[PDB]
Symmetry: C3
Subunit: 54 residues, 3 copies
């Protein structure tokens, strides 16, 4: 009607989009933890084999 | 009717972006996980050689 | 119209967002990767050292 309309819509875009950026980042970071845990545990196992051998 | 049309464009386009964001990021993670695993596979071979070397020493 | 200014606004802000999320998440991965690269380098080094000493000890006897 339309200034107050554009304005309201823009504000909706703003909150929504911002909550999406944060969500993507949490979700990807989680994944990254899940994958990198497997590498850390493998590494933990290897130094422990080494120490035992020594 | 317009406001409803903007907002529902926002919801749809936002939902697709979050998905593309995660999908790309994860793909990059996977590439980095593989590069590390290449390293770990090597290290484990050297431990396996060192191990056989150590039981040669005994004597 | 008003559906055109609000929709182009939404596309531009969605665009910047997508790029920001991927960038930030990849920084996260990069940092964790470095940390682990660090832990690997050290272990590699000790192993190389221990192979050198053991091999030399073997040839000597």
């Amino acid at each position: 009607k339309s200034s107050h309309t554009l304005k309201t819509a823009n504000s909706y875009t703003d909150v929504t989009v911002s909550n999406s950026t944060k969500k993507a980042i949490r979700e990807s970071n989680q994944y990254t933890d899940h994958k990198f845990h497997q590498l850390e545990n493998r590494l933990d196992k290897l130094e422990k084999r080494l120490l035992k051998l020594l």
